[PDB]
Amino acid sequence: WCCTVLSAFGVVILSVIAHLFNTNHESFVGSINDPEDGPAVAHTVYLAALVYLVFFVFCGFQV
Amino acid sequence: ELCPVYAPFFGAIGCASAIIFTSLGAAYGTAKSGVGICATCVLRPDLLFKNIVPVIMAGIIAIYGLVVSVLVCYSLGQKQALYTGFIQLGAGLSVGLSGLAAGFAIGIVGDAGVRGSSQQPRLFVGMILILIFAEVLGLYGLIVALLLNSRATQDVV
Amino acid sequence: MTELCPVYAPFFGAIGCASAIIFTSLGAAYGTAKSGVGICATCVLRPDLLFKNIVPVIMAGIIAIYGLVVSVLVCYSLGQKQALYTGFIQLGAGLSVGLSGLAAGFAIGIVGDAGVRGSSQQPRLFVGMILILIFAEVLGLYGLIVALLLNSRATQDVV
Amino acid sequence: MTELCPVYAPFFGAIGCASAIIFTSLGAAYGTAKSGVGICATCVLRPDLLFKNIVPVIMAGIIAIYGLVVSVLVCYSLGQKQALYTGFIQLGAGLSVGLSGLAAGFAIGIVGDAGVRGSSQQPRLFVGMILILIFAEVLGLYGLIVALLLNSRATQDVV
Amino acid sequence: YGIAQYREINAGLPTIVTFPFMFAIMFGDMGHGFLMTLAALSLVLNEKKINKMKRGEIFDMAFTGRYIILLMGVFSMYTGFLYNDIFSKTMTIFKSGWKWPDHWKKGESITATSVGTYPIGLDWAWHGTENALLFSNSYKMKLSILMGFIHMTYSYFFSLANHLYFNSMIDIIGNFIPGLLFMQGIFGYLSVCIVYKWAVDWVKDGKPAPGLLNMLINMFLSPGTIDDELYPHQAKVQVFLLLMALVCIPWLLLVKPLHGDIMIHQVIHTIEFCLNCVSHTASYLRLWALSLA
Amino acid sequence: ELYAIAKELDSWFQDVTREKAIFEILNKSNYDTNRKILIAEGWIPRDEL
Amino acid sequence: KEEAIFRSAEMALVQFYIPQEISRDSAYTLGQLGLVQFRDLNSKVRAFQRTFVNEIRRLDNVERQYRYFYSLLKKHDIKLYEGDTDKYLDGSGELY
Amino acid sequence: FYTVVGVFIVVSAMSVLFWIMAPKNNQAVWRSTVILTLAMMFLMWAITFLCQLHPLVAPRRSDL
């Protein structure tokens, strides 16, 4: 039951940060100290959002 | 000549001590308050949330230490005048040791207050008032640190 | 720099500010700590005196205010090009006021810690408590008088 | 060695890098030791709480991780001809995280010990113990903040 | 804290709005505020479910404070809108008013020119800059001091209304006007000169911006010792209202105990009031402190 | 029997607690059996008398 | 009209004289109304010699019996059968 | 910069309007919360806008 709301907010947070990364935004990438490689990190964060959605389905199926 | 290579040493030590001494004061305060709370709330669980107040408004001392540390370190410089370093050291010592005194007072006052409130609840307001007057000490230390560091770059040559 | 105004002069001024505020805070801390322990131990049975046994705590706060005032007054006479004189005189004033405040805090804390139980067992002793608190506060008053007289002597006739 | 990059400059940086991990380890060890005494004495009677009352031990481990992060980041910034400014900054960061972590370990060890002894008979005090442990942990977190920001400020704009 | 005895004006009414906004000022963040507001909202819609069940030692105080945290989270929405950080990360909804140079050197120090102004909140160009923290310290300093002063004025006008509800003809003259004049002449003057300092374009006007705390305190040290006056006739204003503040003390000490037997209470009340006003005005800086924390 | 009792035990418990409070207030009054038994005083808001 | 509260509303001290027969019913309806604070009248008379002590102890005994019944209920597979409805009925007593 | 003053005028007009047009029942709490909410919202926004108005310092960045 604990994983429910955690994944609930995690899906949204991962999706929005992934969109910002994929849009090549100044506040996240562009700086030398930043990882750069926007598409790669965006794809990884897409995968993280997908797995959190998987946990959502798995936990909510118990209801 | 007014800018020795060792000038940033005083500023660095001031910035360090501003969080060190405040952290020790807040740590003793939180330790004494927490042992008091968990020694009293065993016999009265439900008043836990109200008895937590010593811990919070003792950790305010560490908050003061952190904010002084940041507002001092953001005045550190490679070519800072010996005077800037000394003023930063003075502000750091002021806030750190004032917070240490405040932590001592808050810790043992909160311990006494939680022991008292374990019996009857009207002591809550009184222990608040006393420990407010204890935390105002770290407040004054914050004041002194702020004004010293504000002057620290007034007319530096 | 010049021999009258060495580069290490601000040490004494900054240390005077720090010593004043720190030692006054230590005195106020011991005072409020002992007084608060006394109050929370004595009005747990008698909570209706609680709002008026806080006087020693108030006087400890007043000592802290003494320290703040002297510290800011010393701080706003500082300077990079300040005379050795100014540094040492501010150091002396800060040390004097801070240690006098420490003594006053010790006295207020101890006597208030005694007097809270004294009053809870006998109400008429509260007047004596307040008189002793006044007498102990006048010590910090002397400390601040010394500190301000030194601060006044600090800046005039400087080179 | 030049004026701004003396031969003895790496002293302060190396001892800061060390003192971080020493003092954080001392705090973590003290906290772990008192928490372990508490856990053993409290869950010899009530063993089902073993998996739960272990949290202050992991919190002391987090203090150790704080020290490790500070030390490993300071170590990389250490350099042969680094400015003595960087050395002083690294020493200050190391002390500011290490002593803060030692104080945090002191507080969290005392609180965790007493709280796990309290939780032997009354189970709802667990949440309050956790909250007070968080308030103790945030002190080491503040030490981490100050150490990291000094470390970042150490290298930038250096002769 | 205490029980409001009768048909005076209490503090319970302004609390419902001052409490959440002070917390938000000390807490401003869309992220954490959003989590806490969702917690409150999920504790509000299921109210009927919770009314018929015991919250328990996890949600006891939360159940009691079931609605406070809701408006609390709304004010957190506001403060995060102004303190533009979301989980300490700044949003880009509004175009920045400050433009970087067209050719920034990789690794070199880069300046910014104020080519515009940000509608609401701090300009997002401030995020991730060395001077940002200082700018934020100064801005909060002043924000916290103004908010705390205005809270003091609001409470002291509550004292005015309390006194005026009864006859209290001696009480108002003895306490309100002298204390109000002292408090205004010092701290409201500080606030208004802060606001004017913001209003005037110091960089564009050529005049250097005077030190705020010096302009505060050289009044108490030596009137007229002004490095740069905020406005014409500034030193005359200094000496005038400083004399006014000084004469407030005999006003606050003498007029109320007249028939005095209550002079002992009056003098402790006066000294307590002045030191307590300066103490609260100082304590208003820890809104800044919590904000930075 | 237990199922029947549980179907109305809460009602009787709440009621009997209410009469407990009622009798506590009754003793709190100035009752005197030598005359009209019950007489007392109370604080009421004026705008609901 | 409205009687909202800035700090308080003008409240009155009212004395009650009531007949013996309807005293208990008046107390019950006042309690389910719940609007008046009774000041001290017979606080001098200590607890062991109050007027209504015998019915107080009888109600204490029946409360102990109810606690015994609830102990049996928790020992068995039933708990608060009327809790859904009885709680509402007691709550519905307001303005009723 | 009189834009903040104009915002003050409009928010004060809204507050003064809602003071009278507040619900005629539960007047106290509703009126107080709405007027103080609007006023203090304006106060904080005015502080922020005036701070961002005429900056005294310019940011330093060593990265893109």
mmCIF file with all atom_site columns, N, CA, C and O in Angstrom, chain G residues 1-34:
data_model
loop_
_atom_site.group_PDB
_atom_site.id
_atom_site.type_symbol
_atom_site.label_atom_id
_atom_site.label_alt_id
_atom_site.label_comp_id
_atom_site.label_asym_id
_atom_site.label_entity_id
_atom_site.label_seq_id
_atom_site.pdbx_PDB_ins_code
_atom_site.Cartn_x
_atom_site.Cartn_y
_atom_site.Cartn_z
_atom_site.occupancy
_atom_site.B_iso_or_equiv
_atom_site.pdbx_formal_charge
_atom_site.auth_seq_id
_atom_site.auth_comp_id
_atom_site.auth_asym_id
_atom_site.auth_atom_id
_atom_site.pdbx_PDB_model_num
ATOM 1   N N  . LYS G 1 1  ? -30.697 36.947 14.248 1.00 0.00 ? 1  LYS G N  1
ATOM 2   C CA . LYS G 1 1  ? -29.756 37.095 13.144 1.00 0.00 ? 1  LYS G CA 1
ATOM 3   C C  . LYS G 1 1  ? -28.479 36.306 13.409 1.00 0.00 ? 1  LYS G C  1
ATOM 4   O O  . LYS G 1 1  ? -28.506 35.264 14.062 1.00 0.00 ? 1  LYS G O  1
ATOM 5   N N  . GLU G 1 2  ? -27.361 36.810 12.893 1.00 0.00 ? 2  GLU G N  1
ATOM 6   C CA . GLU G 1 2  ? -26.078 36.156 13.088 1.00 0.00 ? 2  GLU G CA 1
ATOM 7   C C  . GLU G 1 2  ? -25.493 36.515 14.451 1.00 0.00 ? 2  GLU G C  1
ATOM 8   O O  . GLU G 1 2  ? -25.717 37.602 14.991 1.00 0.00 ? 2  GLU G O  1
ATOM 9   N N  . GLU G 1 3  ? -24.733 35.574 15.009 1.00 0.00 ? 3  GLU G N  1
ATOM 10  C CA . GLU G 1 3  ? -24.064 35.758 16.291 1.00 0.00 ? 3  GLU G CA 1
ATOM 11  C C  . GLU G 1 3  ? -22.620 35.286 16.205 1.00 0.00 ? 3  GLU G C  1
ATOM 12  O O  . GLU G 1 3  ? -22.135 34.552 17.072 1.00 0.00 ? 3  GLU G O  1
ATOM 13  N N  . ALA G 1 4  ? -21.914 35.703 15.155 1.00 0.00 ? 4  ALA G N  1
ATOM 14  C CA . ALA G 1 4  ? -20.534 35.288 14.960 1.00 0.00 ? 4  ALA G CA 1
ATOM 15  C C  . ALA G 1 4  ? -19.650 35.836 16.079 1.00 0.00 ? 4  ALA G C  1
ATOM 16  O O  . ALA G 1 4  ? -20.074 36.640 16.912 1.00 0.00 ? 4  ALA G O  1
ATOM 17  N N  . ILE G 1 5  ? -18.396 35.392 16.089 1.00 0.00 ? 5  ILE G N  1
ATOM 18  C CA . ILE G 1 5  ? -17.488 35.642 17.201 1.00 0.00 ? 5  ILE G CA 1
ATOM 19  C C  . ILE G 1 5  ? -16.179 36.209 16.671 1.00 0.00 ? 5  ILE G C  1
ATOM 20  O O  . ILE G 1 5  ? -15.389 35.486 16.050 1.00 0.00 ? 5  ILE G O  1
ATOM 21  N N  . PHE G 1 6  ? -15.949 37.500 16.917 1.00 0.00 ? 6  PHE G N  1
ATOM 22  C CA . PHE G 1 6  ? -14.599 38.046 16.830 1.00 0.00 ? 6  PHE G CA 1
ATOM 23  C C  . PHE G 1 6  ? -13.738 37.510 17.966 1.00 0.00 ? 6  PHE G C  1
ATOM 24  O O  . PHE G 1 6  ? -12.740 36.822 17.735 1.00 0.00 ? 6  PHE G O  1
ATOM 25  N N  . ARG G 1 7  ? -14.128 37.806 19.207 1.00 0.00 ? 7  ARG G N  1
ATOM 26  C CA . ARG G 1 7  ? -13.441 37.297 20.389 1.00 0.00 ? 7  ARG G CA 1
ATOM 27  C C  . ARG G 1 7  ? -14.422 36.596 21.316 1.00 0.00 ? 7  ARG G C  1
ATOM 28  O O  . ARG G 1 7  ? -14.073 35.604 21.961 1.00 0.00 ? 7  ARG G O  1
ATOM 29  N N  . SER G 1 8  ? -15.644 37.108 21.392 1.00 0.00 ? 8  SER G N  1
ATOM 30  C CA . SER G 1 8  ? -16.699 36.502 22.198 1.00 0.00 ? 8  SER G CA 1
ATOM 31  C C  . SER G 1 8  ? -18.001 37.224 21.882 1.00 0.00 ? 8  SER G C  1
ATOM 32  O O  . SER G 1 8  ? -18.046 38.137 21.053 1.00 0.00 ? 8  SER G O  1
ATOM 33  N N  . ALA G 1 9  ? -19.064 36.794 22.548 1.00 0.00 ? 9  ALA G N  1
ATOM 34  C CA . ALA G 1 9  ? -20.341 37.485 22.534 1.00 0.00 ? 9  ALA G CA 1
ATOM 35  C C  . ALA G 1 9  ? -20.777 37.728 23.970 1.00 0.00 ? 9  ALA G C  1
ATOM 36  O O  . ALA G 1 9  ? -20.405 36.980 24.880 1.00 0.00 ? 9  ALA G O  1
ATOM 37  N N  . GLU G 1 10 ? -21.552 38.792 24.169 1.00 0.00 ? 10 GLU G N  1
ATOM 38  C CA . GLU G 1 10 ? -22.064 39.108 25.495 1.00 0.00 ? 10 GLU G CA 1
ATOM 39  C C  . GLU G 1 10 ? -22.868 37.933 26.033 1.00 0.00 ? 10 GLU G C  1
ATOM 40  O O  . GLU G 1 10 ? -23.898 37.561 25.463 1.00 0.00 ? 10 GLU G O  1
ATOM 41  N N  . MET G 1 11 ? -22.391 37.322 27.110 1.00 0.00 ? 11 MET G N  1
ATOM 42  C CA . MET G 1 11 ? -23.048 36.172 27.708 1.00 0.00 ? 11 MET G CA 1
ATOM 43  C C  . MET G 1 11 ? -23.533 36.521 29.107 1.00 0.00 ? 11 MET G C  1
ATOM 44  O O  . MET G 1 11 ? -23.006 37.426 29.759 1.00 0.00 ? 11 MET G O  1
ATOM 45  N N  . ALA G 1 12 ? -24.550 35.793 29.559 1.00 0.00 ? 12 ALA G N  1
ATOM 46  C CA . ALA G 1 12 ? -25.279 36.136 30.768 1.00 0.00 ? 12 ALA G CA 1
ATOM 47  C C  . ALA G 1 12 ? -25.157 35.035 31.811 1.00 0.00 ? 12 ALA G C  1
ATOM 48  O O  . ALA G 1 12 ? -25.013 33.853 31.483 1.00 0.00 ? 12 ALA G O  1
ATOM 49  N N  . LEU G 1 13 ? -25.212 35.443 33.076 1.00 0.00 ? 13 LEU G N  1
ATOM 50  C CA . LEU G 1 13 ? -25.328 34.516 34.191 1.00 0.00 ? 13 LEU G CA 1
ATOM 51  C C  . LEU G 1 13 ? -26.803 34.372 34.536 1.00 0.00 ? 13 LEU G C  1
ATOM 52  O O  . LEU G 1 13 ? -27.462 35.356 34.891 1.00 0.00 ? 13 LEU G O  1
ATOM 53  N N  . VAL G 1 14 ? -27.320 33.154 34.431 1.00 0.00 ? 14 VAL G N  1
ATOM 54  C CA . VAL G 1 14 ? -28.739 32.887 34.617 1.00 0.00 ? 14 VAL G CA 1
ATOM 55  C C  . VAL G 1 14 ? -28.901 31.854 35.723 1.00 0.00 ? 14 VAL G C  1
ATOM 56  O O  . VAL G 1 14 ? -28.153 30.872 35.786 1.00 0.00 ? 14 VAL G O  1
ATOM 57  N N  . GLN G 1 15 ? -29.858 32.093 36.612 1.00 0.00 ? 15 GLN G N  1
ATOM 58  C CA . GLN G 1 15 ? -30.178 31.149 37.669 1.00 0.00 ? 15 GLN G CA 1
ATOM 59  C C  . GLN G 1 15 ? -31.439 30.376 37.303 1.00 0.00 ? 15 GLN G C  1
ATOM 60  O O  . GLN G 1 15 ? -32.339 30.896 36.637 1.00 0.00 ? 15 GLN G O  1
ATOM 61  N N  . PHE G 1 16 ? -31.482 29.115 37.723 1.00 0.00 ? 16 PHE G N  1
ATOM 62  C CA . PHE G 1 16 ? -32.567 28.206 37.383 1.00 0.00 ? 16 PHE G CA 1
ATOM 63  C C  . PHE G 1 16 ? -33.284 27.766 38.650 1.00 0.00 ? 16 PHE G C  1
ATOM 64  O O  . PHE G 1 16 ? -32.646 27.287 39.593 1.00 0.00 ? 16 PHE G O  1
ATOM 65  N N  . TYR G 1 17 ? -34.604 27.926 38.666 1.00 0.00 ? 17 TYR G N  1
ATOM 66  C CA . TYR G 1 17 ? -35.459 27.312 39.674 1.00 0.00 ? 17 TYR G CA 1
ATOM 67  C C  . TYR G 1 17 ? -36.427 26.384 38.956 1.00 0.00 ? 17 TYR G C  1
ATOM 68  O O  . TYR G 1 17 ? -37.156 26.818 38.058 1.00 0.00 ? 17 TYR G O  1
ATOM 69  N N  . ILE G 1 18 ? -36.423 25.110 39.338 1.00 0.00 ? 18 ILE G N  1
ATOM 70  C CA . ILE G 1 18 ? -37.197 24.097 38.618 1.00 0.00 ? 18 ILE G CA 1
ATOM 71  C C  . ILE G 1 18 ? -37.890 23.190 39.614 1.00 0.00 ? 18 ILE G C  1
ATOM 72  O O  . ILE G 1 18 ? -37.415 22.971 40.736 1.00 0.00 ? 18 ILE G O  1
ATOM 73  N N  . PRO G 1 19 ? -39.039 22.645 39.222 1.00 0.00 ? 19 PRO G N  1
ATOM 74  C CA . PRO G 1 19 ? -39.728 21.672 40.074 1.00 0.00 ? 19 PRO G CA 1
ATOM 75  C C  . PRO G 1 19 ? -38.976 20.350 40.142 1.00 0.00 ? 19 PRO G C  1
ATOM 76  O O  . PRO G 1 19 ? -38.208 19.986 39.250 1.00 0.00 ? 19 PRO G O  1
ATOM 77  N N  . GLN G 1 20 ? -39.220 19.630 41.238 1.00 0.00 ? 20 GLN G N  1
ATOM 78  C CA . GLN G 1 20 ? -38.532 18.363 41.467 1.00 0.00 ? 20 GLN G CA 1
ATOM 79  C C  . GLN G 1 20 ? -38.890 17.330 40.406 1.00 0.00 ? 20 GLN G C  1
ATOM 80  O O  . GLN G 1 20 ? -38.018 16.591 39.932 1.00 0.00 ? 20 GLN G O  1
ATOM 81  N N  . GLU G 1 21 ? -40.168 17.258 40.028 1.00 0.00 ? 21 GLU G N  1
ATOM 82  C CA . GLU G 1 21 ? -40.627 16.181 39.154 1.00 0.00 ? 21 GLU G CA 1
ATOM 83  C C  . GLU G 1 21 ? -39.962 16.240 37.784 1.00 0.00 ? 21 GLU G C  1
ATOM 84  O O  . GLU G 1 21 ? -39.519 15.212 37.258 1.00 0.00 ? 21 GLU G O  1
ATOM 85  N N  . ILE G 1 22 ? -39.878 17.430 37.192 1.00 0.00 ? 22 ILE G N  1
ATOM 86  C CA . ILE G 1 22 ? -39.346 17.586 35.844 1.00 0.00 ? 22 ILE G CA 1
ATOM 87  C C  . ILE G 1 22 ? -37.871 17.963 35.849 1.00 0.00 ? 22 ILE G C  1
ATOM 88  O O  . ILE G 1 22 ? -37.331 18.345 34.808 1.00 0.00 ? 22 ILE G O  1
ATOM 89  N N  . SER G 1 23 ? -37.206 17.871 37.002 1.00 0.00 ? 23 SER G N  1
ATOM 90  C CA . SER G 1 23 ? -35.810 18.284 37.089 1.00 0.00 ? 23 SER G CA 1
ATOM 91  C C  . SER G 1 23 ? -34.919 17.423 36.202 1.00 0.00 ? 23 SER G C  1
ATOM 92  O O  . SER G 1 23 ? -34.077 17.938 35.459 1.00 0.00 ? 23 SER G O  1
ATOM 93  N N  . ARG G 1 24 ? -35.092 16.101 36.269 1.00 0.00 ? 24 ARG G N  1
ATOM 94  C CA . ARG G 1 24 ? -34.258 15.209 35.471 1.00 0.00 ? 24 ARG G CA 1
ATOM 95  C C  . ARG G 1 24 ? -34.514 15.398 33.982 1.00 0.00 ? 24 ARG G C  1
ATOM 96  O O  . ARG G 1 24 ? -33.577 15.386 33.177 1.00 0.00 ? 24 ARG G O  1
ATOM 97  N N  . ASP G 1 25 ? -35.780 15.566 33.595 1.00 0.00 ? 25 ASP G N  1
ATOM 98  C CA . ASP G 1 25 ? -36.092 15.781 32.186 1.00 0.00 ? 25 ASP G CA 1
ATOM 99  C C  . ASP G 1 25 ? -35.514 17.100 31.690 1.00 0.00 ? 25 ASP G C  1
ATOM 100 O O  . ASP G 1 25 ? -35.005 17.177 30.564 1.00 0.00 ? 25 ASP G O  1
ATOM 101 N N  . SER G 1 26 ? -35.587 18.151 32.511 1.00 0.00 ? 26 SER G N  1
ATOM 102 C CA . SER G 1 26 ? -34.984 19.424 32.137 1.00 0.00 ? 26 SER G CA 1
ATOM 103 C C  . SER G 1 26 ? -33.476 19.290 31.993 1.00 0.00 ? 26 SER G C  1
ATOM 104 O O  . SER G 1 26 ? -32.884 19.834 31.055 1.00 0.00 ? 26 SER G O  1
ATOM 105 N N  . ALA G 1 27 ? -32.839 18.557 32.907 1.00 0.00 ? 27 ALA G N  1
ATOM 106 C CA . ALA G 1 27 ? -31.403 18.337 32.797 1.00 0.00 ? 27 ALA G CA 1
ATOM 107 C C  . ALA G 1 27 ? -31.062 17.582 31.520 1.00 0.00 ? 27 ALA G C  1
ATOM 108 O O  . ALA G 1 27 ? -30.091 17.916 30.835 1.00 0.00 ? 27 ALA G O  1
ATOM 109 N N  . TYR G 1 28 ? -31.858 16.567 31.177 1.00 0.00 ? 28 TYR G N  1
ATOM 110 C CA . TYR G 1 28 ? -31.587 15.790 29.971 1.00 0.00 ? 28 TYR G CA 1
ATOM 111 C C  . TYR G 1 28 ? -31.748 16.635 28.714 1.00 0.00 ? 28 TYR G C  1
ATOM 112 O O  . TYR G 1 28 ? -30.898 16.586 27.813 1.00 0.00 ? 28 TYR G O  1
ATOM 113 N N  . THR G 1 29 ? -32.829 17.416 28.629 1.00 0.00 ? 29 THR G N  1
ATOM 114 C CA . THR G 1 29 ? -33.031 18.230 27.435 1.00 0.00 ? 29 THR G CA 1
ATOM 115 C C  . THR G 1 29 ? -32.002 19.348 27.346 1.00 0.00 ? 29 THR G C  1
ATOM 116 O O  . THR G 1 29 ? -31.589 19.721 26.244 1.00 0.00 ? 29 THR G O  1
ATOM 117 N N  . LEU G 1 30 ? -31.562 19.877 28.488 1.00 0.00 ? 30 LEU G N  1
ATOM 118 C CA . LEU G 1 30 ? -30.507 20.880 28.481 1.00 0.00 ? 30 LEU G CA 1
ATOM 119 C C  . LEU G 1 30 ? -29.182 20.274 28.037 1.00 0.00 ? 30 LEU G C  1
ATOM 120 O O  . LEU G 1 30 ? -28.424 20.902 27.289 1.00 0.00 ? 30 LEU G O  1
ATOM 121 N N  . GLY G 1 31 ? -28.887 19.054 28.492 1.00 0.00 ? 31 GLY G N  1
ATOM 122 C CA . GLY G 1 31 ? -27.660 18.395 28.083 1.00 0.00 ? 31 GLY G CA 1
ATOM 123 C C  . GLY G 1 31 ? -27.633 18.081 26.602 1.00 0.00 ? 31 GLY G C  1
ATOM 124 O O  . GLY G 1 31 ? -26.613 18.278 25.936 1.00 0.00 ? 31 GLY G O  1
ATOM 125 N N  . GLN G 1 32 ? -28.750 17.591 26.060 1.00 0.00 ? 32 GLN G N  1
ATOM 126 C CA . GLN G 1 32 ? -28.808 17.397 24.617 1.00 0.00 ? 32 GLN G CA 1
ATOM 127 C C  . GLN G 1 32 ? -28.935 18.712 23.861 1.00 0.00 ? 32 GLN G C  1
ATOM 128 O O  . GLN G 1 32 ? -28.761 18.725 22.637 1.00 0.00 ? 32 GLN G O  1
ATOM 129 N N  . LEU G 1 33 ? -29.235 19.810 24.554 1.00 0.00 ? 33 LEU G N  1
ATOM 130 C CA . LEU G 1 33 ? -29.093 21.147 23.993 1.00 0.00 ? 33 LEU G CA 1
ATOM 131 C C  . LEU G 1 33 ? -27.667 21.660 24.157 1.00 0.00 ? 33 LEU G C  1
ATOM 132 O O  . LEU G 1 33 ? -27.071 22.164 23.200 1.00 0.00 ? 33 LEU G O  1
ATOM 133 N N  . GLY G 1 34 ? -27.114 21.533 25.361 1.00 0.00 ? 34 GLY G N  1
ATOM 134 C CA . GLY G 1 34 ? -25.720 21.843 25.610 1.00 0.00 ? 34 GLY G CA 1
ATOM 135 C C  . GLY G 1 34 ? -25.315 23.267 25.302 1.00 0.00 ? 34 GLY G C  1
ATOM 136 O O  . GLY G 1 34 ? -24.583 23.513 24.338 1.00 0.00 ? 34 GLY G O  1
#
